[PDB]
Amino acid sequence: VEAFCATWKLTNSQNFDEYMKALGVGFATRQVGNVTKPTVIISQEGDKVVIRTLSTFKNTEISFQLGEEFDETTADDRNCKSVVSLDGDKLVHIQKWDGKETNFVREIKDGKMVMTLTFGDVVAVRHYEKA
Ligand X SMILES: CCCCCCCC/C=C\CCCCCCCC(=O)O
Name which position in 22, 38, 84, 93 contacts ligand X (CB under 6 A): 38
Distant-in-sequence, close-in-space partners of 1: CB < 8 Å, separation ≥ 6 = 49, 66, 86, 91
User: Which residue's Cβ lies closest to ligand X?
Assistant: 33
14-33 residues near ligand X, rule: CB under 6 A: 20, 25, 29, 33
Rounded CA separation 105/107 (Å): 7
Name which position in 40, 62, 83, 84 contacts ligand X (CB under 6 A): 40
Name which position in 55, 63, 85, 118 contacts ligand X (CB under 6 A): 55
118 touching ligand X, by CB under 6 A: no
7 touching ligand X, by CB under 6 A: no
Please report how close the Cβ of residue 42 comes to ligand X at its closest, in angstroms.
Answer: 10
Which residues on adjacent β-strands are paired with residue 43? 50
* Ramachandran area for residue 48 (φ above 0: left; ψ -120 to 50: alpha; else beta): beta
Cα dihedral across residues 47, 53, 33, 131: positive or negative: negative
